[PDB]
From a paper:
As expected from the phosphorylation profile, RIP2K-AMPPCP show a typical active state, within AMPPCP bound the active state between the N-and C-lobes. The R-spine is aligned, the DFG motif is in the expected IN conformation, the Helix αC is inwardly displaced and Glu66 in Helix αC (Glu91 in PKA) forms a salt bridge with Lys47 from strand β3 (Lys 72 in PKA). Only residues 164–172 and 186–196 could be traced for RIP2K-AMPPCP chain B, implying that there is no electron density for any of the phosphorylation sites detected by mass spectrometry. The AS is close to the loop containing the site of ubiquitination Lys209 (residues 200–210, referred to here as the Lys209 loop), which is also disordered. Both structures crystallised in the tetragonal space group P41212 with a dimer in the asymmetric unit, in agreement with the size exclusion chromatography profile. In the RIP2K-AMPPCP structure, there is an extensive hydrogen-bonding (H-bond) network linking together Helix αC and the ordered part of the AS with their surroundings including the N-terminal anti-parallel β-strands. Therefore, the active conformation of RIP2K is stabilised by a specific H-bond network which connects Helix αC with the magnesium binding loop, the AS, and the N-terminus without involving any phosphorylation site. In the active conformation, the 2-fold symmetry related N-termini (residues 6–9) form anti-parallel β-strands that are further stabilized by His71 from Helix αC and Arg74.
NOD1 and NOD2 (Nucleotide-binding oligomerization domain-containing proteins 1 and 2) are cytosolic receptors of the innate immune system, which respond to intracellular fragments of the bacterial peptidoglycans, D-glutamyl-meso-diaminopimelic acid (iE-DAP) and muramyl dipeptide (MPD), respectively. Upon ligand recognition, NOD receptors oligomerise and recruit an adaptor protein, Receptor Interacting protein kinase 2 (RIP2), through interactions of their respective CARD domains. RIP2 undergoes auto-phosphorylation and K-63 linked ubiquitination at Lys209, becoming a scaffolding protein for downstream effectors.
Author numbering:
A (entry chain B): 5 to 172, 183 to 201, 205 to 299
B (entry chain A): 6 to 172, 188 to 200, 207 to 300
Write the structure that this text describes.
């Protein structure tokens, strides 16, 4: 049993802690590791409140998942900082933010060239396919453009394993826009959540649009999706000059199909799309 | 918190092609049939039956790579462990080795300074990480052929075949290793630094390795002059000073990698992003 231990990073080795992002459940900060001399990201529980023991278990579980799931397109975990009053997952620092920022910050990024977009889509599928091929399979359950991070040369690192589950009545978690309709309510199709999210991501990458942008109430989105409505496919959302437009639309519509049986495995998706990805030059 | 190294069944390796044969094994490219990625496979000779001592060497190397994972270390993806096949499966590095970058002058007429300095910085970060493990991992075979370059020319340190937990060419070896070794890696790094900044083969004109060994034991080192190291090398004086400490006759005069990074960080910092 060849084993790799996740390093424990003592608190005094984290220098220059700076707020990057605060959320509901925790905070992401940048830091430098004083000994390794690299920039890191630290995803930690709130510094304000005392540390709840159930919150501690959630962080340890996420850290273990990241550690086990390591692969070319998955955010590398560097260690865990586990202290009486501080608990943080230490990962590689991603200099180029998230796919969300790339797609929707149109002043910062006026042009996002097709080969880059297709490489991003290919790398996401490779990352998730890897997760689904683990024993037991790891299901991400929160794939979205905000959780696809971009390294120094805009290669994909899938992040945020907070809702992930090993496949071994309540529905799984997720973000509503990227969630298939069968996951909305209590009461086998669990494995087809990630591909649905990927289809919405693909639509979002090729359009540079917010899915369901005109729909102001998320409950209306949920009602419409449960009736089979999806982000709009027309000349306006998806211009005619998108490379391999017909094949990509066909794949999207299978990926987000109402019937989960009509959605491909990620392996199937890769087999179907490899000829498309291959047409692009380095 | 434990991570298991995957066992990759032989039937999942497709399109096996010879890349490089050495004395102890062979490196082949392949595709993983399920993961749909290109891989490199470092395996024992397909011709001979598999000696059990050779098997243990490969397993030991695989374990070291698995434990040593870090941003500047070659990622191991799994082990293929079969009755008649034994191979370490790693990420495929598209841009070869630092050796090829430096010495294939038709293929690479210009290697710009910011790239060279970034490479030197990343090597030191990789080795510093190894030396900071508990117990420390000593590489003991650092050379330009063992520094691999990924798709955007970032460093992955490879070849852990001679590595040791702290409980072939002699040009990168300090003299105390062959006098008739905690400071071995930094000595190799000093020679690598000279090689990166010069684009020259260390001791190129010395035809007998025994002459190299004798000369080094007497304090001779790769030549530092205007010809080997041009005056227009950024931070030339500081870099020469560092090199000469890194390969100092007395191992006590050679820095830790942490010390080397502390001393060189201001130099590395002057360069803009590529
Ligand atoms: N390694 C990393 N490098 C650089 N930035 C990172 C990073 N990890 C996270 N971030 C930034 O922090 C933000 C939140 O990270 P993440 O999604 O994992 O936290 P979280 O799970 O607590 C949000 P939520 O509670 O909504 O699920 C990311 O969108 C990104 O901007
Ligand atoms: N992941 C990888 N990706 C691409 N090429 C690789 C590679 N790993 C090794 N190579 C190539 O094979 C060559 C030899 O690899 P490596 O040094 O690890 O084997 P080895 O230890 O058997 C040689 P020696 O017997 O001299 O020690 C490398 O220099 C490189 O050209
Ligand atoms: Co498990
Ligand atoms: Mg989350
Ligand atoms: Mg070797």
């Amino acid at each position: 049993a060849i084993c790799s231990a996740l390093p424990t990073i003592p608190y005094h080795k984290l220098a220059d802690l700076r707020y990057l992002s605060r959320g509901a459940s925790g905070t992401v900060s940048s830091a430098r590791h004083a000994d390794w001399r690299v920039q890191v990201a630290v995803k930690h529980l709130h510094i304000h409140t005392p540390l709840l023991d159930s919150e501690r278990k959630d962080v340890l579980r996420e850290a273990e998942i990241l550690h086990k799931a390591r692969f070319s397109y998955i955010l590398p975990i560097l260690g865990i900082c586990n202290e009486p009053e501080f608990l943080g997952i230490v990962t590689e620092y991603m200099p180029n933010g998230s796919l969300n920022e790339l797609l929707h910050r149109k002043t910062e990024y006026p042009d996002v060239a097709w080969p880059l977009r297709f490489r991003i889509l290919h790398e996401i599928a490779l990352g998730v396919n890897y997760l689904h091929n683990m024993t037991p399979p790891l299901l991400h359950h929160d794939l979205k453009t905000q959780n696809i991070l971009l390294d120094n040369e805009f290669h994909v690192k899938i992040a945020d394993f907070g809702l992930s589950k090993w496949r071994m009545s309540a529905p799984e978690g997720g973000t509503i826009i990227y969630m298939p309709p069968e996951n909305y309510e209590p009461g086998r199709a669990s494995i087809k959540h990630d591909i649905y999210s990927y289809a919405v991501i693909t639509w979002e990458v090729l359009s540079r649009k917010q899915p369901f942008e005109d729909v102001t109430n998320p409950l209306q989105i949920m009602y419409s999706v449960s009736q089979g409505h999806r982000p709009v496919i027309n000349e306006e959302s998806l211009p005619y000059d998108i490379p391999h437009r017909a094949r990509m639309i066909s794949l999207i519509e299978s990926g987000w199909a109402q019937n989960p049986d009509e959605r491909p495995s990620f392996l199937k998706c890769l087999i179907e799309l490899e000829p498309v990805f291959r047409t692009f030059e380095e």
